[PDB]
Design a protein around this ligand. Structure first.
Ligand SMILES: *[C@@H]1O[C@H](CO)[C@@H](O[C@@H]2O[C@H](CO)[C@@H](O[C@@H]3O[C@H](CO)[C@@H](O)[C@H](O)[C@H]3NC(C)=O)[C@H](O)[C@H]2NC(C)=O)[C@H](O)[C@H]1NC(C)=O
Ligand SMILES: *[C@H]1O[C@H](CO)[C@@H](O[C@@H]2O[C@H](CO)[C@@H](O[C@@H]3O[C@H](CO)[C@@H](O)[C@H](O)[C@H]3NC(C)=O)[C@H](O)[C@H]2NC(C)=O)[C@H](O)[C@H]1NC(C)=O
Ligand SMILES: *[C@@H]1O[C@H](CO)[C@@H](O[C@@H]2O[C@H](CO)[C@@H](O)[C@H](O)[C@H]2NC(C)=O)[C@H](O)[C@H]1NC(C)=O
Ligand SMILES: *[C@@H]1O[C@H](CO)[C@@H](O[C@@H]2O[C@H](CO)[C@@H](O)[C@H](O)[C@H]2NC(C)=O)[C@H](O)[C@H]1NC(C)=O
Ligand SMILES: *[C@@H]1O[C@H](CO)[C@@H](O[C@@H]2O[C@H](CO)[C@@H](O)[C@H](O)[C@H]2NC(C)=O)[C@H](O)[C@H]1NC(C)=O
Ligand SMILES: *[C@@H]1O[C@H](CO)[C@@H](O[C@@H]2O[C@H](CO)[C@@H](O)[C@H](O)[C@H]2NC(C)=O)[C@H](O)[C@H]1NC(C)=O
Lengths: 775, 676
């Protein structure tokens, strides 16, 4: 009554210890009640291993407890998958990574950390890389018996970073005394153990002015944090004098960078940036700059925040009639997505796009169609079913005429009684030609009381060469069904006329040499006297049918001939005119790579060589085709070329553009995207101002443009414009919402400040201003 | 007789210890014999500091020995530069980084290294980052008293990597016994000291099949190695079963990669790639892949091999005649080059391309032109001189009128007597406007027996607002020379007319608000009522001149105003119309990438937005422009676009094709090859 559907899959990750053991339950619903077979990475169904791996009832795959010696990679470190299936269809679950890890010994280390008196320290708890996955930092402990846990900052100095390190703010002599050591927990065994080696802070006292330096390799790193956690970006840099750390985030993909906005969610402890409550929007390339009076160094971080994968197919089940299209839409959530791929009753298909579209359904299309959305660490699945339409039964042929041979003279009566719902029309064909009430052929069709169509083909007096391949076609607007059969008439070989076969590039020409007369011996196809099959395109069969695979003009455009001859002498010739028209070849486009800014001049060029003479070239914007009122100038070029000109680009002109060009016996097109961005415009460019002594200076600079611009500021110090340099890093002077927020204005803060509005669409917007003091 | 030239510059880097001291000698040649003044980062000439820094004879800058307390950043951690100069001209040397470092204590550490029995180990000698620059690894020592130096591999197992690490190949139980410790040398103090902490190999039994793992951050790194050294690329990856390491080099810039070719010069020890005798060609993005039966991990390295910077200007000295062009070519070697920049007699110029080209030389162009080629760690300089040729003397102004003020009424007689060879023409200008025999201005010019031009400007009865900045221009076809001077007339403020100033993208607009009347107090420029300093590009001076640097249309195309007002009330307004003309931007082409076969249909499309209205678009084939007989159909597109159609392609149509399109106040073009 219903195909299978997963009610409960196993998780993506199952990690466990050899003393703990593990079980993974896979529950599937269906009708008939499906069996649950477990499968392996390659596709083979997984077997049993007494003691290590057992397949139990209710689709429960069990990995019982075991000893180190009993550990076996094949079983305890393997990619499993649950496959639920009934006689109606099959569905394989998402990937289940089984990782049994034998409870092995590990010891964490904490080594000496060297600091230049004044800089901030990061005491790292070194865990053996090979056990990292299962071991993490829990709490730090000092020899003075102080215990630093994760959470808020202790004494405004000591802070346990999310990533496990102990971050000592502003290291001074009073801290080279304490010996620090970490306490780790193994997330499978459940033991918390202290480090075997205690670290300490070697504090060295500054004499020479040391340029800020980073640990070479530590200059660049990529991190992948789990969703809605607390992320810890570090900027390892020592130096003297004590340097200052500034954080920036690059704008998606570009070389432009915005300064990081400090607040309640994102905070900066010394040089380390802490980001609370992570979201996917926080993903990107982060740059930390570290300056001091001597020099400046910089480090970067490629940060990627995750989001659980989850899939859903619309609709869950659908019933489609034969011949009609079936649509599956895969709806998915999660980040990042590396591979969206489709599947059918276990085995995969070629489709790797969200929407799977069957153009014309048939029997073999029945069953389950799965959609997979997977990445490096996760895999989400979604299921769906296709039922064969029905209670809407297609055309079938019951009492149908069968093969016959005869001598000319007698009346022949062929009958095709076809049934179906709705009641179909029955048309008659002879060797591909539709014959009607022509000559002495009479063709009839009535409907029986039961609702079946009885169609007769009466031939008054079958003639020498009426014989051939007759077929009736039971066609319904719900699908088609045909029945062919051979009628042989005594007589000399006689080949019918063949109207010119007009085929287009690359199509497969299938043609049958329509012979007549029954003692026919040999039907051979010839081109210019040579036997037809002489190249990779051409195939010919003794039944008298020719078939060319990939049609091409100067190759196979010609007048073919078929010769039919009986035993002892008599022969007949037929001449086919294979016309191979040249299908138009559209050459690709290129918009000016700006992209286009509002108020532009865009020129698009559609050029196409191909089928001479008729050339119908049109332009199409997603859904419709150019109403001139809109303001888009479509022109042609002499030899049926085309140029789409758009002066005065507007937002309305944004979207999917397509040159749709067709030519006698073909239709080809090409699509190009058109994005219409907008530059920065001011909505409040600043007002020349003089504040009172020590008043909080609130001067608002603000623009509007697409993409949203960033509002920089700068200052020129000595009462003169020209230096325009970055502001003076202090809580006194802040930038927020594009507003210059300079609290408690100092009498030295006279002079010109300059706000720039930029999104990178055109050159920048800029504004100069003088902020002064009064007392 | 000759401008200065550097015979001996100081090195880019001078590092030294407070007990050792250091001297940097800068020797320069010339005629007259040039003085050698030492300069500082900003451009100021460096002074003396008794005890710490002393400027001695022979251009020797001396940094004598000193005590820790005496160390001072300003002096002992500074960017110095030698400047040699004579009365003929000036030349400043390459940058000299002086880094005095007080002999301070350091202790190297060697910590526990954990390995999965079977994998290869890399025992690292941890040096304090802040002393790295002056401390490197010399040799390793084991508690069993074995000493591993750099060079070839010991016992086919132990190897000291170039970068100082101890690389233990295929670690087995028999090696968790030995305690390893490194011996470092300080390259300034000259002491070699052992590590304060001995490391060891914690060897662990493999039971669980562990996927190869790298140290997260250690997945990506950029290195910059010195030329012709031995480079050491590492691929830190443990795992079980014992994994296999494959190295690849990416093809310059692309996503395609080639497998690294092992031989005698480049060898692979376990997972670490060693490259001997480095060359710039070895620079690139290297990828190490590490696979095993369970999984696969990968690390990358951005490797950059250096090459000493060295510059040379062709020619070293040249003598050019007035009005004629002077060419300097900067020839340089070295890698990488970040900035090729030109300079003149100390102060820099705007040119940042190899070939410096003076289009028309004049007096002020005489002297030295330096070329700099610099990067992050190095800076190479090259010098050159320009002498003034002639025996063909340029225009000079002898008896010239000087500044004056007066009340209106009297007749004024300005005289510019200019000399030169040939005898120049003298034209008169007022505030940028050329005035002739207009109104009651009479302007004359005769030639004296001696061959000097005596040009007079007689104003019949100087009026209220004839006053302003008068200048005479002594122009010769061998060069030019001008003389300006101020004439003040007593009247109310009065600003002249200003014809629309038509400027093109990026040009520098310089404009002076032509006021008249002498008790004038305040000349201020305004845009739409705000005072005109209102965007980066804009500068304004109390003399009443405005100047915009980089002109751009919607930014600064507008009608500017200048207001001039005297003390107590009276004012006058002037309106300038600054127009930004736009130079045409031609969009590139694309022939069908076949290439074209004889008997073809080729369609080429020349599209250009820019200067509205006039648009002259032509097509050019190497040497000439389309004779229609040949069989090439040139068409236009509605809004002055262009389409070159060639049906029936022939051999004659092969060659260099170019769309040459010009627009009022500009000419732009683009070339495409046509290969049949
Ligand atoms: C107001 O009026 C002048 C225009 O009428 C302004 O223009 C500036 O004049 C300066 C001369 O006083 C020039 O300065 C010189 O610039 C050259 C650059 O090539 C230097 O070598 C000189 O050493 C320098 N001399 C000094 C120290 O002044 C400016 O170049 C010029 N600006 C431009 C680009 O036109 C002046 O701002 C001002 N002067 C007066 C007379 O009041
Ligand atoms: C304004 O420009 C000039 C004064 O600013 C005047 O040019 C003057 O022409 C005079 C002709 O009358 C010359 O006077 C002659 O000087 C020579 C010197 O060697 C004597 O021999 C002549 O006797 C004498 N001419 C006579 C007989 O008067 C002057 O050379 C010359 N003035 C000066 C001092 O340079 C113009 O008069 C006047 N107008 C114009 C159109 O320029
Ligand atoms: C799973 O493997 C571990 C390691 O072989 C076993 O745990 C050890 O058990 C022995 C014998 O009782 C103890 O001496 C060790 O101290 C244990 N190792 C640890 C964790 O320190 C464990 O017994 C195995 N599970 C079984 C036998 O099913
Ligand atoms: C402070 O340090 C930063 C980073 O080193 C410097 O910023 C760079 O300056 C150069 C010019 O010298 C620019 O081309 C780079 O784009 C800047 N890096 C960035 C931010 O991407 C800055 O110049 C330093 N301050 C000093 C001493 O000038
Ligand atoms: C440069 O300063 C250093 C640091 O003070 C001096 O080195 C001292 O040398 C004495 C005797 O040679 C030793 O006791 C110590 O190793 C150093 N003092 C300490 C503890 O810092 C050095 O003398 C100075 N250079 C000179 C000679 O002026
Ligand atoms: C060894 O394993 C590595 C894993 O690092 C394989 O390389 C990846 O293969 C995936 C397969 O989908 C590719 O899409 C990635 O581009 C590869 N990642 C990188 C950059 O390493 C590799 O297939 C294995 N080696 C071979 C060639 O068999």
């Amino acid at each position: 009554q219903k195909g299978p559907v997963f009610l409960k899959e196993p998780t993506n990750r199952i990690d466990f210890s050899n003393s703990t053991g593990a079980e993974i339950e896979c529950k599937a619903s269906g009708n008939p009640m499906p069996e649950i077979i477990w499968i392996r990475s390659d596709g083979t169904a997984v077997g049993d291993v007494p003691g290590l791996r057992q397949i139990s009832s209710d689709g429960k795959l069990v990995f019982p407890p075991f000893r180190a010696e009993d550990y076996r990679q094949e079983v305890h470190a393997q990619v499993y998958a649950c496959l639920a299936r009934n006689q109606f269809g099959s569905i394989i679950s998402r990937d289940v990574h089984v990782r049994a890890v034998v409870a092995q010994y590990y010891e964490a280390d904490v080594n000496k950390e060297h600091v230049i008196r004044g800089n901030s320290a990061v005491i790292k708890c070194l865990i053996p890389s090979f056990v990292a996955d299962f071991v993490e930092v829990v709490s730090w402990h000092t020899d003075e018996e102080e215990n630093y846990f994760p959470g808020a900052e202790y004494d405004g100095k000591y802070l346990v970073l999310p990533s496990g390190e102990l971050h000592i703010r502003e290291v001074g002599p009073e801290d080279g005394y304490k010996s620090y050591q970490c306490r780790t927990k193994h997330r499978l065994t459940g033991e918390t153990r202290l480090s075997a080696t205690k670290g300490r802070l070697v504090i060295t006292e500054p004499i020479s002015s040391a340029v800020p330096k980073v640990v070479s390799l530590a200059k660049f790193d990529m991190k992948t944090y789990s969703g809605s956690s607390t992320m810890a970006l570090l900027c390892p840099a020592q130096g003297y004098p004590v340097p200052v750390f500034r954080w920036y985030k690059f704008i998606e993909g570009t070389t432009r960078k915005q300064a990081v906005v400090l607040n309640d969610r994102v905070k900066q402890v010394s040089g380390t940036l802490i980001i609370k409550d992570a979201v996917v929007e926080d993903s990107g390339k982060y740059l930390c700059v570290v300056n001091n009076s001597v020099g400046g160094e910089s480090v970067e971080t490629v940060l990627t925040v995750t989001a659980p994968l989850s899939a859903k197919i619309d609709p869950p089940t659908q019933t489609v009639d034969f011949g009609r299209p079936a649509v599956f839409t895969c709806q998915y959530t999660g980040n990042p997505i590396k591979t969206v791929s489709w599947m059918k009753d276990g085995k995969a298909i070629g489709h790797s796009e969200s929407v799977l579209r069957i153009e014309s359904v048939k029997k073999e299309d029945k069953g389950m169609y799965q959609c997979f959305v997977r990445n490096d660490r996760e895999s989400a699945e979604a299921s769906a079913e296709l039922k064969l339409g029905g209670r809407f039964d297609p055309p079938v042929i019951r009492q149908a005429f069968q093969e016959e041979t005869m001598e000319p003279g007698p009346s022949v009566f062929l009958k095709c009684v076809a049934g179906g719902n709705p009641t179909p029309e029955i048309s008659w064909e002879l060797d591909g030609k539709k014959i009607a009430n022509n000559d002495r052929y009479q063709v009839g069709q009535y409907v029986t009381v039961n609702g079946d169509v009885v169609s007769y083909l009466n031939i008054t007096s079958v003639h020498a060469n009426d014989g051939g391949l007759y077929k009736c076609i039971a066609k319904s607007k719900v699908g088609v069904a045909e029945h062919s059969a051979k009628l042989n008439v005594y007589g000399l070989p006689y080949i019918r006329q063949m109207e010119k076969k007009a085929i287009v590039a690359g199509e497969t020409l299938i043609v049958t040499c329509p012979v007549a007369g029954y003692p026919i011996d040999s039907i051979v196809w010839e081109r210019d006297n040579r036997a037809l099959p002489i190249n990779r395109k051409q195939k010919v069969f003794p039944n008298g049918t020719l078939i060319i695979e990939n049609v091409e003009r100067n190759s196979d455009q010609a007048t073919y001939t078929c010769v039919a001859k009986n035993q002892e002498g008599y022969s007949a010739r037929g001449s086919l005119e294979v016309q191979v028209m040249v299908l138009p070849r559209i050459i690709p486009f290129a918009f000016e790579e700006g992209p286009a800014q509002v108020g532009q001049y865009l020129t698009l060029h559609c050029s196409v060589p191909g089928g001479d003479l008729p050339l119908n070239i049109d332009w199409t914007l997603d859904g419709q085709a150019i109403s001139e009122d809109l303001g888009i100038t479509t022109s042609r070029v002499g030899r049926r070329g085309s140029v789409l000109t758009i002066e005065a680009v507007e937002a309305s002109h944004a979207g999917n553009f397509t040159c749709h060009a067709r030519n006698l016996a073909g239709h080809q097109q090409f699509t190009t995207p058109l994005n219409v961005y907008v530059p920065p415009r001011w909505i409040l460019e600043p007002t020349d101002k003089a504040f009172a002594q020590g008043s909080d200076a609130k001067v608002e600079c603000k623009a509007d443009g697409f993409p949203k611009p960033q509002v920089t500021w700068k200052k020129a110090v000595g009462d003169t414009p020209g230096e325009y340099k970055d502001l003076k890093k202090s809580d006194n002077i802040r930038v927020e919402e594009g507003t210059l927020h300079v609290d408690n204005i100092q009498k030295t803060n006279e002079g010109y400040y300059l706000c720039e509005a930029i999104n990178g669409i055109g050159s920048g917007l800029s504004a100069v201003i003088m902020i002064s003091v009064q007392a």
